[PDB]
Amino acid sequence: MDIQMTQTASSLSASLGDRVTISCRASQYINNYLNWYQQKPDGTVTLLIYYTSILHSGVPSRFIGSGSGTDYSLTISNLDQEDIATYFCQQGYTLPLTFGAGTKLELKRPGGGGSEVKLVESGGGLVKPGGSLKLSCAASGFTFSTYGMSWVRQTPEKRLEWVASISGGGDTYYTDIVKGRVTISRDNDRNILYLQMSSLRSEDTAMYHCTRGALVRLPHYYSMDYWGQGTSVTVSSLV
């Protein structure tokens, strides 16, 4: 059965300089294979922490990841304007890869927020149910052929859903609800990742992000260490 990730709070209210802890619970043991992502108000997603407690590049030591078993926490000290964002946990222990629903950090007053691997998605658009699209992701700034790559979509309700992954060697993995309706593929000469989509359904409407997989532990524990800005797919009988 799929591992469900629960973030009980959807938003926490705090003041600048405060310390806040965001909880994440897995429905099953996940061997500390837990990643945290930060999504800024403008939609930009970055990796924050991988393997429960290890900071991604650029991330300041004010972020502390902890936990074990099924219970995990992200503690942010000395809360800064740039931390006003939504935080998502994600287990990478078994397929399908699954995400919590997100916890936003907000300030007591309204408002808040502040600010070489490149991934650029294209090919989204509007189609009727039963239609088809092909998404592309142009990658640069790294040796593309050595990395696993994935597609992750964010629904209009703001849920992150892993769609598909492809290993450096070309093995493919999909979430059940898209199997037989999408195909992930890659061109290691042009450094492009693709998602062919057939028989689209209204519930495929989402922003589709290309992500680079970084292998954390063999055989297949990955973090999604860089994310594109996304390409938007809208499926509606009103098209």
Ligand SMILES: COc1ccc(-c2ccc(Cl)c(Cl)c2)cc1Cl
């Ligand atoms: C059998 O279990 C798995 C198989 C494949 C992946 C996986 C996850 C992310 C990426 Cl980027 C890639 Cl290439 C493979 C992850 C798991 Cl848990």
